[PDB]
Design an enzyme around this catalytic site. Structure first.
Site, PDB file in Angstrom:
ATOM      1  N   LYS A   1       0.828  -1.202   0.000  1.00 50.14           N
ATOM      2  CA  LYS A   1       0.000   0.000   0.000  1.00 50.14           C
ATOM      3  C   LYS A   1       0.864   1.255   0.000  1.00 50.14           C
ATOM      4  O   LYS A   1       0.656   2.177  -0.797  1.00 50.14           O
ATOM      5  CB  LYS A   1      -0.924  -0.005   1.216  1.00 50.14           C
ATOM      6  CG  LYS A   1      -1.927  -1.130   1.238  1.00 50.14           C
ATOM      7  CD  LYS A   1      -2.793  -1.044   2.471  1.00 50.14           C
ATOM      8  CE  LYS A   1      -2.010  -1.413   3.707  1.00 50.14           C
ATOM      9  NZ  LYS A   1      -1.671  -2.853   3.718  1.00 50.14           N
TER      10      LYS A   1
ATOM     11  N   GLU B   1       1.787   4.822  12.041  1.00 53.25           N
ATOM     12  CA  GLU B   1       2.645   4.125  11.095  1.00 53.25           C
ATOM     13  C   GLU B   1       4.093   4.200  11.560  1.00 53.25           C
ATOM     14  O   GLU B   1       4.403   4.753  12.619  1.00 53.25           O
ATOM     15  CB  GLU B   1       2.486   4.697   9.684  1.00 53.25           C
ATOM     16  CG  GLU B   1       1.283   4.140   8.983  1.00 53.25           C
ATOM     17  CD  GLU B   1       1.336   2.634   8.901  1.00 53.25           C
ATOM     18  OE1 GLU B   1       2.351   2.103   8.411  1.00 53.25           O
ATOM     19  OE2 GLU B   1       0.375   1.976   9.349  1.00 53.25           O
ATOM     20  N   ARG B   2       4.984   3.624  10.759  1.00 52.40           N
ATOM     21  CA  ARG B   2       6.391   3.554  11.124  1.00 52.40           C
ATOM     22  C   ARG B   2       7.024   4.936  11.107  1.00 52.40           C
ATOM     23  O   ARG B   2       6.866   5.694  10.147  1.00 52.40           O
ATOM     24  CB  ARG B   2       7.131   2.628  10.162  1.00 52.40           C
ATOM     25  CG  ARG B   2       6.607   1.213  10.154  1.00 52.40           C
ATOM     26  CD  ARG B   2       7.354   0.358   9.158  1.00 52.40           C
ATOM     27  NE  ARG B   2       6.789  -0.980   9.086  1.00 52.40           N
ATOM     28  CZ  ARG B   2       5.724  -1.295   8.361  1.00 52.40           C
ATOM     29  NH1 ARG B   2       5.116  -0.367   7.640  1.00 52.40           N
ATOM     30  NH2 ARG B   2       5.271  -2.537   8.356  1.00 52.40           N
TER      31      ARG B   2
HETATM   32  N1  LIG Z   1       6.004  -1.862  -6.727  1.00 51.10           N
HETATM   33  C1  LIG Z   1       6.726  -2.853  -6.187  1.00 51.10           C
HETATM   34  N2  LIG Z   1       7.382  -3.688  -6.982  1.00 51.10           N
HETATM   35  C2  LIG Z   1       8.094  -4.667  -6.418  1.00 51.10           C
HETATM   36  N3  LIG Z   1       8.222  -4.904  -5.125  1.00 51.10           N
HETATM   37  C3  LIG Z   1       7.573  -4.082  -4.275  1.00 51.10           C
HETATM   38  C4  LIG Z   1       6.802  -3.028  -4.772  1.00 51.10           C
HETATM   39  N4  LIG Z   1       6.269  -2.372  -3.721  1.00 51.10           N
HETATM   40  C5  LIG Z   1       6.673  -2.970  -2.574  1.00 51.10           C
HETATM   41  N5  LIG Z   1       7.453  -3.990  -2.951  1.00 51.10           N
HETATM   42  C6  LIG Z   1       7.888  -4.630  -1.859  1.00 51.10           C
HETATM   43  O1  LIG Z   1       6.789  -5.204  -1.171  1.00 51.10           O
HETATM   44  C7  LIG Z   1       6.748  -4.662   0.175  1.00 51.10           C
HETATM   45  C8  LIG Z   1       5.762  -3.522   0.244  1.00 51.10           C
HETATM   46  O2  LIG Z   1       5.750  -2.985   1.551  1.00 51.10           O
HETATM   47  P1  LIG Z   1       5.449  -1.357   1.738  1.00 51.10           P
HETATM   48  O3  LIG Z   1       5.017  -0.745   0.369  1.00 51.10           O
HETATM   49  O4  LIG Z   1       6.681  -0.678   2.220  1.00 51.10           O
HETATM   50  O5  LIG Z   1       4.254  -1.149   2.827  1.00 51.10           O
HETATM   51  P2  LIG Z   1       2.982  -2.072   3.268  1.00 51.10           P
HETATM   52  O6  LIG Z   1       3.313  -2.811   4.517  1.00 51.10           O
HETATM   53  O7  LIG Z   1       1.752  -1.168   3.511  1.00 51.10           O
HETATM   54  O8  LIG Z   1       2.666  -3.075   2.150  1.00 51.10           O
HETATM   55  C9  LIG Z   1       8.159  -4.153   0.444  1.00 51.10           C
HETATM   56  O9  LIG Z   1       8.987  -5.228   0.894  1.00 51.10           O
HETATM   57  C10 LIG Z   1       8.616  -3.654  -0.924  1.00 51.10           C
HETATM   58  O10 LIG Z   1      10.033  -3.802  -1.065  1.00 51.10           O
HETATM   59 MG   LIG Z   2       1.906  -1.581   5.591  1.00 50.06          MG
END
Ligand SMILES: Nc1ncnc2c1ncn2[C@@H]1O[C@H](COP(=O)(O)OP(=O)(O)O)[C@@H](O)[C@H]1O
Ligand SMILES: [Mg+2]
Ligand SMILES: Nc1ncnc2c1ncn2[C@@H]1O[C@H](COP(=O)(O)OP(=O)(O)OP(=O)(O)O)[C@@H](O)[C@H]1O
Ligand SMILES: [Mg+2]
Lengths: 174, 52, 74, 509, 463, 463, 73, 52, 73
Positions: free
Chosen positions: F153, F179-180
């Site tokens: 997200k 959040e963090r």
């Molecule tokens: N667009 C993307 N393409 C590839 N890997 C992704 C992408 N977005 C996130 N990831 C990975 O998936 C996870 C997403 O977590 P993050 O976006 O930070 O928050 P949330 O906990 O709300 O999902 C992270 O480990 C990130 O490195």
């Molecule tokens: Mg999250």
């Protein structure tokens, strides 16, 4: 909630007092006990965890001095066992209400914008006697917040002729 | 659109009355505050006694 | 602040104000206080035994299951 | 400038004169829109209570020493120590043919900013449905405009049809299309929105205004920011406005949107009043909450309406149709509120998500959608024609488990699949464009007699649309003959068949 | 001698009496100001009784004087209650005038004792071919009509009443417990058209009334049926009454709604603790006694089509037969639409129905449930590749399914007023012949919408 | 006057005042000895109010005197809050000094009336293939990013900021709700490394703080946005305002933690009985009115990957475009993990996006749905039992699923490949060809992590 | 270690540049390989692209294995 | 054009509110109407109060 | 290394508080410019202990009978 839990004790106390013809003594004792339990220091010394109910009854006997009897001691002992000592003021209020009702005496409060003299108070007393009671206990109260008129409060019944006319007209305007 | 014009006319005519009534009521309250006496108080409390 | 006990009744409290003798009326007699859905709550019955067989006035029979602090379910 | 002066002068001089004894009480506890009062020994259950600031409450709990009451405004302006008074009244709303086209709050207060509502009558919000003796059978049709609903789940005048399905499947779209299709039937509509954000209500109102269907509709809006009391009371106040027409010989149609949200609001109200909960934390009497609301939608006989109007409307009979909407979680129709509501209504229309994605719009599920009124709520021609559609879908649904294995089957079942796929493709329909009964009749007849058996499945929708347009152009008198009455004779069937044959021969969609 | 209302919460009223004069349980209280009527449920001490309201709880104050009647709710009974419509308390609601009788009985009574049970179990025959063969009723039994989408279940009920009446002069009682008003009105008009209203008494709680009504309408109807049964005419023998309860599921939920407020903890799925007690108290008065009998037909609603929850599970202990209507069988053109394989009965026993009846029923069930299994094979391969055996099964099963069709007399439209009421012996003969194969050469379209085998023979020969 | 504390149960203090000077419902109180600030919630009567604490409650006695302010929480607004980090009470926590404004606004306010409801449909191109094709945005409408824990997200939100806010000519507000803290620091330093720090105002009540802070934090965040919306510069128009909230679910979660302490019966699962109302009161202030437009992006947590849970199931009705992330797709390596069958929008109709785009989107969804239905047969049986059309659909659906993957501009830290920004026309042209079958000869591995359709052909040729 | 569900939101910033630039989409490579091998258990065609991906995923999977108390550098 | 006409209406509305300001100051003697008229005209004594 | 032990026979309060004591012990180095590393073992058992503590206080539970603020823990 508190008033609900005080129904049986107050009714029993009033019935016993009326049947024994000692309503005045119970009224005085109940007012004294309500005032005592309302106190902060006395209540703190009363709710000590080391005290058995007999100790609390004896403490009440000591603070009450005279006017005590086996009836009041038994009543306090019964209250203490069920831990209902905290709700004595509601019991006193209920007892006073029942005693007033049995004597066909109702209380009224007359609130005005100016202090009243004797003839107006007597006239209002006579007028309220058409409620067909024994007597009215008129406690007059001045309110400069009002502008003019007298509001009378008898239990839950109120009669208004004061500045509330202004608000009533305001609502009709808007 | 014509109906909207009519609704605007009605809205303005309704809106003005609120301020008019509010100012009239406030002026009335000022008049009654200016009047300070007990004879009016005595007169209508004595009226109330028979009004019961 | 807890709800009213079955033992908190105007008539019973008046009697208690009267006197505390007779040890709750000889400890083997009761007085019904509540009736609902086949359950009867009795006030008194000091010598009630868990599982005892209680007889009412009509000629019926009960069985004391709850021996609480101030009442006796049956 | 002077008429207002005369009005205010005569009003001021009219009243505000006497003094009257009243029964008061004192506020004690205020929290979350619930207020408790010490006093009001004469408070009635459901009575309307006034407060010092001008707000209005409703007494629900009459305990031994306190009265719990909800607040119909915003409770943030109330403080303990203020006083409350009993008015000896009940909640009432304005009714009449003046609320048509208006958007009103749950109490009949205009919120669209188009000036005051001049209504000459007020009626109680809490009423009782007419007795069993005054009713009459349901034998008049309400057209919704969908080829699937009108042929397989018919809806009569006075019936109560439920619309149930998962989120975002088209429930509101079906309700709005049903409202739009009533342009010429001359039945008034009432749309009640409960617990919806105001933007959606505004969009729905604009869409109704674009099609001209707002000239005979009243919208009651209890949005998501409104207090729980308004969301609890809105359906009843909409039903009263609807019942205005029923008791005077005219027909009405009311659509409750998301009765689930009314149930949620009432659960919030009941839990804060410390009433014991049941399954899913709902109060025990949710069924009685919905029943006394849905049971008012009925059809009354000419004797009742003649008695009600004292002889003014002698000839006719009234009615009131309801379309409650429920939403289910992951198709779980075994939950509490949907189980309660399904028991009361005379049918339901299940909308499926899997059917919605696959292109079948509307997503009506014919397997589990019923209508207890049945054939008696259809015009003669559609009643005569719907049998082929129903049996084709039944056969196509019995053996849908083998749909992907048509290569390994006999010839009979393969032909059954071939026809079932085509009839399923026929039921698709766009939004905001309803069909008159003539279009449905023509399409269904063309499907029954196998005129669609030689066209590939991917092109059926275009075939149907072109056929209906061709009939609208060439055969206007026949179309008007069918629409006006609904007859079905040898002449009509011969004309329809001749038109279909000429279309297939000479049009080439 | 009279008390005051001290607490109103929902539909649960409280009254405070003098401690010397406190009404018994199930007494009837009449509020002085209005027409509302209360009945006592519990006693809470201090002369306080907790009640529920039979009617409008809106407009009731606190401190409103209440007087007692010192007796349970008494309803009118007799021959003067035939053809009327009455609410819970016995007040007419058809606006035909006051009920002209003086006999009254309390609606709360004890169940019949063990000693006075019927010495035998008679067989009750209707005339519908499906029911009399596969799901035979019992004299003074209990019959449930499970399932069924929007279909003529009401049509089935009035067919049953017409059949019981025109065959036997016994009376009937209809008690709609939480019924839709539309269906009740349709039923009343149908009874009025067929001139059968002279032999039916009705009670209505119309699904939008306080739960006291929907709770006690069944008991009112049962009291009326009990009085009809117990009347002994011209010989010393009681009649045979028929009692309908149009929805028994509403009866349980009516008590479920009031259970929580009365001060009871919940149960398995939120029901009251006394679900089985209430169901037993209601259902134990419907039995055949030494003098007369009450037989009943009770439509049952299964919530979410899940019959393992307590509401129908506790009913299943009392039913003697279960007739299960079906959507598909009605769709295929079979009007009575009783499911042959699912609908069963406790009365299908060689001791009570003889040996030929039982064997014929078993053979028909076996044929039907083998043909139902052959469905997928028939659909995939076709009829040609089946063995020589199991083709006869398909043909005979199709013939049997057709032969369960029945023309309904009360219809009189699209049918031709064809009252058939075939004797059981005719159906036994016909199905024995059909299973044996004497009729194996007749087209299946002949077995459709006729009565006895004479009619199917005539129809086949005509074509 | 002033009151004193009499109970402390976690985060819910309660104070006793005089009978005359009790505060209002949402007044603000200040403990004398410390910096703790209390907000009244309930008014228990008898001169007692029940409040919650806007800070840590460690080391608070009973009997500490409390003074009132006779006014709700007031936060600063205006242009002086631009480029500043602020807490719940609007006190600067970036150590740049006090804010240079004098304006104040209470954080508790009624929603705009129904009369002032301006709704517009002006498309907004974000440059993401699946977002543009399936669930288009609208300038002035509310968006939500549903998803489990760790499905992306926050990354999607930071992508949408990059594609819009950088090119956006207008203010913005970022409000982190539970959040963090690391993410907040990273966002602050990312904005400050660029030069767009002068266009955002930040409010951070984060996941390490007492529930009082996390509860009334979003209110400040959109209190600033309301002032930015309803503002006019002379000889100038209203300014378009963005609003980004992170895990609005934490707002209700922080209300659940203090529910029982306020003395309420729990609702269905564990939630407070006032869930729907306390979510609506917040969600109704985010709309856009006749003056000014607020574009809102909200990430909404989903507990235990359950879209049926009461809070996510209640949030759906408050959004225009709902983007649902799936854990299976993310675990399959496809990023972004947007589920193409649950993403919807009111902007996907022929009268807004045009006929061609609508047809392409519906065809894509139909293909994906049919593949989802076939997925069960190909598991038990083989792929070779299907007809040729079904195999073709399976191949096309796998290619479509691959083609929705895309390298974001902000995700190059995790993988390394540079980001891509695909215009809408390229997406439509690529999917039209892919549905027409023109690309049946391209292996499905060439549709993975690429931009427009040309990159697919180039990658196929490289293979 | 399940390469499908395991991430480090810090990413490549937490390792020396050698490992940072060597390890590319290794994790995503295995994530796609798992699903491809699960989907193509019964694939009788096995075009060269899928065969190469499946013959590389097994190499990478078998690559990452070590024993208790055996720290690399 | 509607803005043109209503911006004339409102420009007259200051004068209309002055009219009704005189009219409301005259209505301010309905504080007599609320009164039993013990002071049947108490406002005429001093009416300085300035209202629009 | 420092080891903080809260075994299976210890009172639920000790299991509830052990990770906080460990974190406080570890933060001594962080505040003074020195790196540190802490390993909580079976936080699920801390959650179980806190659930036991909360249920005995008669607090209404949420999903799987875990208390309302198991996240804030
Ligand atoms: N667009 C993307 N393409 C590839 N890997 C992704 C992408 N977005 C996130 N990831 C990975 O998936 C996870 C997403 O977590 P993050 O976006 O930070 O928050 P949330 O906990 O709300 O999902 C992270 O480990 C990130 O490195
Ligand atoms: Mg999250
Ligand atoms: N026949 C149709 N043809 C094309 N689109 C349709 C059709 N029927 C419904 N839709 C589309 O379905 C979309 C989503 O359904 P809809 O708008 O009716 O919401 P809903 O079912 O009321 O759900 P919710 O209560 O969650 O808002 C609508 O945007 C509408 O355009
Ligand atoms: Mg909807």
């Amino acid at each position: 909630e508190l008033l609900t839990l005080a129904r049986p004790y107050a009714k029993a106390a009033f019935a016993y007092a009326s049947e024994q013809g000692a309503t005045d003594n119970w009224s005085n004792a109940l007012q004294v006990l309500s005032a005592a339990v309302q106190d902060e220091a006395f209540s703190a010394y009363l709710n000590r965890p080391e005290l058995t109910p007999a100790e609390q009854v004896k403490l009440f006997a000591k603070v009450l001095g005279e006017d005590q009897s086996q009836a009041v001691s038994n009543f306090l002992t019964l209250l203490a066992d069920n831990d209902r000592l905290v709700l004595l003021p509601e019991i006193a209020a209920e007892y006073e209400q029942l005693k007033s009702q049995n004597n066909n005496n109702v209380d009224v409060v007359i609130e005005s914008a100016f202090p009243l003299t004797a003839e107006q108070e007597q006239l209002l007393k006579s007028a309220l006697e058409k409620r067909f009671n024994s007597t009215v206990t008129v406690s007059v109260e001045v309110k400069p917040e009002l502008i003019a008129g007298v509001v009378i409060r008898a239990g839950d019944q109120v009669i208004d002729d004061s500045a509330l006319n202004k608000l009533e007209k305001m609502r009709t305007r808007l | 659109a014509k109906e909207a014009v009519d609704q605007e006319i009605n809205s303005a005519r309704e809106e003005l009355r609120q301020q008019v009534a509010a100012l009239a009521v406030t002026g009335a309250e000022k008049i009654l505050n200016q009047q300070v006496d007990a004879e009016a108080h005595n007169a209508m409390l004595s009226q109330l006694a028979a009004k019961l | 602040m807890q709800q009213l006990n079955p033992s908190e009744i105007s008539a019973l409290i008046k009697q208690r104000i009267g006197d505390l003798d007779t040890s709750a009326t000889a400890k083997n007699e009761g007085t019904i206080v509540m009736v609902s859905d086949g359950i009867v709550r009795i006030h008194g019955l000091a010598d009630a035994m868990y599982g005892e067989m209680i007889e009412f006035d009509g000629g019926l029979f009960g069985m004391a299951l709850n021996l609480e602090q101030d009442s006796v379910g049956a | 400038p002077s008429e207002i002066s005369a009005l205010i002068k005569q009003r001021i001089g009219d009243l505000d004169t006497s003094a009257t004894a009243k029964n008061e009480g004192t506020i004690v506890m205020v929290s979350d829109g619930i207020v408790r009062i010490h006093g009001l020994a004469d408070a009635m259950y459901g009575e309307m209570i006034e407060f010092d600031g001008g707000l209005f409450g409703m007494a629900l709990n009459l305990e031994q020493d306190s009265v719990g009451a909800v607040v119909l405004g915003n409770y943030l302006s109330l403080q303990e120590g203020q006083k409350a008074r009993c008015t000896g009244r009940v909640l009432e709303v304005p009714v009449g043919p003046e609320l048509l086209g208006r958007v009103v709050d749950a109490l009949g207060n205009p919120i669209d900013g188009k000036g005051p509502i001049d209504a000459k009558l007020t009626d109680a919000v809490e009423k009782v449905a007419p007795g069993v003796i005054w009713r009459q059978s349901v034998d008049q049709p309400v057209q919704t405009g969908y080829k699937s609903v009108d042929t397989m789940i018919p809806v009569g005048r006075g019936q109560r049809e439920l619309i149930i399905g998962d989120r975002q499947t088209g429930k509101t779209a079906m309700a709005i299309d049903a409202i739009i299709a009533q342009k010429n039937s001359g039945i008034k509509c009432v749309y009640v929105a409960i617990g919806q954000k105001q933007s959606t209500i505004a969009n729905v109102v604009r869409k109704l205004e674009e099609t001209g269907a707002m000239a005979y509709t009243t919208v009651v809006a209890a949005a998501a920011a409104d207090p729980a009391a308004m969301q609890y009371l809105a359906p009843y106040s909409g039903c009263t406005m609807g019942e205005y027409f029923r008791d005077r010989g005219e027909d009405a149609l009311i659509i409750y949107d998301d009765l689930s949200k009314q149930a949620v609001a009432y659960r919030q109200i009941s839990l804060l009043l410390r009433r014991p909960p049941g399954r899913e934390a709902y109060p025990g009497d949710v069924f009685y909450l919905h029943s006394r609301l849905l049971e008012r939608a009925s059809r009354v006989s000419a004797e009742y309406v003649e008695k009600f109007t004292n002889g003014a409307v002698t000839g006719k009979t009234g009615s009131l149709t309801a379309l409650p909407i429920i939403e289910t979680q992951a198709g779980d129709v075994s939950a509490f509120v949907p189980t309660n509501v399904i028991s009361i209504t005379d049918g339901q229309i299940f909308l499926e998500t899997s059917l919605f994605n696959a292109g079948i719009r509307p997503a009506v599920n014919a397997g589990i959608s019923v209508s207890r009124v049945g054939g008696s709520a259809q015009t003669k021609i559609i009643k005569k024609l719907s049998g082929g559609i129903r049996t084709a879908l039944a056969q196509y649904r019995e053996l849908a488990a083998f749909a992907q294995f048509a290569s390994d089957l006999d010839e009979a079942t393969r032909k059954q699949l071939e026809h079932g796929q085509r009839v399923t493709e026929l039921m698709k329909q766009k939004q905001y464009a309803p069909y008159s009964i003539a279009d449905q009749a023509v399409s269904v007849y063309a499907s029954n007699e196998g005129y669609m058996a030689d066209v590939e499945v991917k092109k059926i929708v275009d075939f149907d649309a072109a056929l209906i347009a061709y009939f609208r152009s060439e055969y206007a008198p026949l179309m008007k003959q069918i629409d006006e009455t609904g007859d079905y004779n040898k002449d009509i069937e011969a004309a329809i068949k001749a038109g279909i044959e000429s279309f297939k021969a000479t049009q080439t969609y | 001698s009279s008390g005051r209302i001290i607490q109103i919460i929902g539909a649960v009223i409280d009254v405070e009496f003098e401690r010397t004069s406190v009404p018994k349980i199930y007494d009837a209280l009449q509020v002085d100001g209005t027409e509302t009527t209360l009945e006592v449920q519990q006693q809470l001490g201090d002369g306080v009784v907790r009640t529920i309201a039979m009617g409008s709880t809106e407009g009731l104050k606190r401190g409103l004087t209440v007087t007692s009647t010192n007796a349970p709710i008494s309803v009118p009974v007799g021959t003067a209650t035939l053809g009327r419509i009455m609410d819970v308390l016995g007040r007419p609601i058809d606006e035909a005038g006051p009920v002209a009788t003086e006999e009254r009985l309390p609606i709360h009574r004890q169940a019949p004792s063990y000693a006075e049970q019927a010495a035998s179990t008679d067989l009750l025959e209707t005339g519908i071919k499906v029911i009399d063969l596969l799901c035979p009723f019992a004299k003074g039994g209990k019959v449930g009509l499970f399932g069924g989408a929007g279909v003529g279940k009401t049509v089935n009920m009035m067919e049953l009443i017409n059949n019981i009446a025109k065959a036997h002069s016994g009376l009937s009682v209809f008690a709609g417990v939480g019924e839709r008003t539309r269906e009740g009105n349709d039923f009343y008009h149908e009874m009025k058209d067929s001139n059968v209203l002279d032999k039916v008494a009705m009670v209505y709680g119309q699904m939008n009334e306080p739960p006291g009504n929907r709770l006690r309408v069944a008991l009112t109807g049962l009291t009326m049926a009990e009085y009809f049964r117990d009347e002994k005419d011209e010989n010393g023998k009681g009649r045979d009454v028929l009692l309908f309860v149009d929805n028994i599921y509403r009866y349980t939920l009516a008590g479920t709604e009031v259970s929580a407020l009365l001060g009871r903890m919940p149960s398995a799925v939120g029901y009251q603790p006394t679900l089985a007690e209430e169901m037993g108290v209601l259902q134990e008065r419907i039995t055949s006694t030494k003098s007369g009998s009450i037989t009943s037909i009770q439509a049952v609603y299964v919530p979410a089509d899940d019959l393992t929850d307590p509401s129908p599970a506790t009913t299943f202990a009392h039913l003697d037969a279960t007739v299960v209507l079906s959507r598909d069988i009605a769709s295929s053109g079979i009007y009575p639409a009783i499911d042959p394989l699912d609908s069963t009965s406790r009365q299908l026993d060689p001791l009570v129905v003889g040996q030929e009846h039982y064997e014929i029923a078993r053979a028909v069930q076996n044929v039907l449930q083998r043909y139902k299994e052959l469905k997928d094979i028939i659909a995939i391969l076709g009829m040609d590749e089946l063995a020589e055996e199991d083709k006869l099964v398909v043909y005979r099963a199709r013939k049997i399914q057709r032969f369960f069709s029945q023309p309904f007399h009360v219809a009189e439209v699209f049918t031709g007023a064809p009252g058939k009421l075939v004797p059981l012996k005719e159906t036994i003969r016909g199905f024995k012949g059909l299973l044996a194969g004497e009729y194996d050469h007749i087209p299946e379209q002949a077995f459709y919408m006729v009565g006895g085998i004479d009619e199917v023979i005539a129809k086949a020969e005509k074509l």
